[PDB]
Design a protein around this ligand. Sequence first.
Ligand SMILES: OC[C@H]1O[C@@H](O[C@H]2[C@H](O)[C@@H](O)[C@H](O[C@H]3[C@H](O)[C@@H](O)[C@H](O[C@H]4[C@H](O)[C@@H](O)[C@H](O[C@H]5[C@H](O)[C@@H](O)[C@H](O)O[C@@H]5CO)O[C@@H]4CO)O[C@@H]3CO)O[C@@H]2CO)[C@H](O)[C@@H](O)[C@@H]1O
Ligand SMILES: [Gd]
Ligand SMILES: [Gd]
Ligand SMILES: [Gd]
Ligand SMILES: [Gd]
Ligand SMILES: [Gd]
Ligand SMILES: [Gd]
Ligand SMILES: [Gd]
Ligand SMILES: [Gd]
Ligand SMILES: [Gd]
Ligand SMILES: [Gd]
Ligand SMILES: [Gd]
Ligand SMILES: [Gd]
Length: 92
Amino acid sequence: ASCGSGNFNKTAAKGVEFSAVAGDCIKYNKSSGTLQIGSWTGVASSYNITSGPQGITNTGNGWTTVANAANGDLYIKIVSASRSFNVKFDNW
Ligand SMILES: OC[C@H]1O[C@@H](O[C@H]2[C@H](O)[C@@H](O)[C@H](O[C@H]3[C@H](O)[C@@H](O)[C@H](O[C@H]4[C@H](O)[C@@H](O)[C@H](O[C@H]5[C@H](O)[C@@H](O)[C@H](O)O[C@@H]5CO)O[C@@H]4CO)O[C@@H]3CO)O[C@@H]2CO)[C@H](O)[C@@H](O)[C@@H]1O
Ligand SMILES: [Gd]
Ligand SMILES: [Gd]
Ligand SMILES: [Gd]
Ligand SMILES: [Gd]
Ligand SMILES: [Gd]
Ligand SMILES: [Gd]
Ligand SMILES: [Gd]
Ligand SMILES: [Gd]
Ligand SMILES: [Gd]
Ligand SMILES: [Gd]
Ligand SMILES: [Gd]
Ligand SMILES: [Gd]
């Protein structure tokens, strides 16, 4: 389903890893700078930001920089991932 401020199921804290699964809809407040999505589980994942960048990918071995994500509350849908994985959202 859709992902947004009405049905997010997890909230990410800046720099704090959490277990993520395909289908999750994650709230993340970016106060400034550029969004970063990082994972080291080796599980490939992809994301859509509501009203924002689409088709973001991460190999599971480092950080994906997402230019042009708004400051403020973001809603990030995990579109694809083969299994649960540990991920963190950050900004700098
Ligand atoms: O502050 C003003 C100034 O900020 C600059 O922005 C900086 C920012 O402040 C830094 O935090 C950021 O640094 C990040 C590093 O680039 C990145 O390499 C590092 O990534 C770590 C990750 O945090 C860590 O979790 C991960 O650990 C994994 C191990 O590698 C694996 O062995 C193990 O299995 O799994 C663990 C995780 O469970 O390691 C990676 C490295 O491999 O994260 C840093 C943030 O925490 O850099 C920014 C600059 O590049 C900004 O640039 C300036 O403009 C601004 O003025
Ligand atoms: Gd709520
Ligand atoms: Gd850890
Ligand atoms: Gd775990
Ligand atoms: Gd920058
Ligand atoms: Gd937008
Ligand atoms: Gd990098
Ligand atoms: Gd908002
Ligand atoms: Gd808010
Ligand atoms: Gd808030
Ligand atoms: Gd699967
Ligand atoms: Gd770990
Ligand atoms: Gd910072």
